[PDB]
């Protein structure tokens, strides 16, 4: 994150044989684009939703500086 090598958080995502709640077939990534659903739970990837909320957080924090307050801008 500090080094800017943000791709490292997307390397080695959860495989297509991952059993939810267990380490079998898991990965190490935390923020990924995968799209679709988990092959086992038939639901969105947890790494997809974490990345989604991080992007939403950055966007809303940026957008929260729009209106004027005690600092002239």
């Amino acid at each position: 994150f500090f080094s800017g090598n943000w791709k490292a958080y997307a390397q080695n995502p959860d495989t297509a044989s991952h059993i939810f709640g267990s380490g079998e077939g898991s990965g190490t990534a935390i923020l990924t684009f995968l799209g679709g659903f988990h092959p086992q739970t038939k639901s969105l990837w947890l790494t997809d939703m974490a990345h989604h909320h991080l992007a939403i957080a950055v966007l809303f924090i940026v957008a929260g500086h729009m209106y004027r307050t005690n600092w002239l801008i």
């Binding site: 943000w6 791709k7 997307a10 390397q11 684009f33």
Partner: protein
């Protein structure tokens, strides 16, 4: 103050006290350059070369952000030009 307007163009105060003082001959070419740069950055990050995890290029991203901006710069350029600036 009084950003309300009814003439041909709004007063320069609507541009803020940073764009209110830019000559239109500066904003115009700057807006065109920003639009061209942003379009090229968007077409280089995507379209011409498909996006990949290993290829994000903050320059192209930050660049692409100049396209939305360009819109604002040339709007301000027109506003300055019509206000004799």
């Amino acid at each position: 103050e009084s950003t309300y307007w009814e003439g041909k163009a709004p007063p320069s105060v609507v541009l803020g006290p940073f764009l209110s003082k830019i000559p239109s001959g500066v904003l115009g070419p700057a807006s065109l350059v920003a639009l061209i740069v942003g379009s090229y950055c968007t077409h280089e990050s995507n379209i011409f070369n498909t996006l990949t995890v290993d290829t994000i290029y903050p320059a192209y991203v930050l660049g692409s952000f100049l396209t939305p901006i360009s819109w604002g710069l040339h709007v301000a350029a027109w506003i300055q030009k019509m206000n004799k600036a």
